[PDB]
Subunit: 62 residues, 6 copies
């Protein structure tokens, strides 16, 4: 790898605008995994066997 | 790796705007994992076997 | 690794604006993990087997 | 006139609800009479020759 | 006139609710009569020749 | 006129609620009569020739 004058953006999250007006919500969770908000995960590299990256709303009952 | 004049952004989260006006919410969680807010995870590298990176709303009952 | 004039940003979270006006909330958690606020995790490297990085709203009943 | 146990309502205006959300308006009046709001006139009696009662948006160039 | 146990309401204005949210307005009046707000006129009796009662947005160039 | 146990309301204005949120306004009046607010006029009797009662947004260039 060798960069020369490189305006690079690599593994990036941006400009995630989210408006909400007069919105009702209601959750009744029992042992599950409810996800309702904003999730902005930015990575570059994940190694490994059996790994898990960026696990939103994940239920693992192995 | 070798950089020369490199305006790099690597593994980054930004500009996550979030407005909310007159919004009701209500959660009744029992042993689960409810997630409702803003989550901005930025990493670059995660190694390892069986690891977990960026685990929002995760329930692990292995 | 070798940098020369490198305006680098690596493993960074910024500009996470969050407004909230006249918003009700109500949580009734029992042994779970409810997460409702802002979470800005920024790392660069995490090693290890079986590790966990950036675990929001996580329930581990292994 | 003679009342006995008389729940009378005579010459009355009520319960004039008026909502407005995200509404633009723009008037360019020149010598006229522009009327844009809420007008609730309640009278009982008006006598006289040539009189005028309850004159909204009225232009009189006699 | 003679009242006996008379819950009378005569010449009355009430319960004029008026909400407005995020509303622009703009007036450019020149010698006219622009009316934009709430007007609640309640009278009972007006006598006289040539009189005027309850004159909103009125232009009289006689 | 003779009252006996008479809960009378005569020539009355009440309960004029008026909310306004995030509302712009702009007036450029030149010799006219711009009216933008709340006006609650309550009278009972007005006599006389050529009189004027309850004159909102009135321009008289006779």
């Amino acid at each position: 790898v060798l960069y020369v004058g490189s305006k690079t953006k690599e593994g990036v999250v941006h400009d995630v605008t989210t408006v909400a007006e007069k919105t009702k919500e209601q959750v009744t969770n029992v042992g599950g995994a409810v996800v309702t908000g904003v999730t902005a995960v930015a990575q570059k590299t994940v190694e490994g066997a059996g790994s898990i990256a960026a696990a939103t709303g994940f239920v693992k009952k192995d």
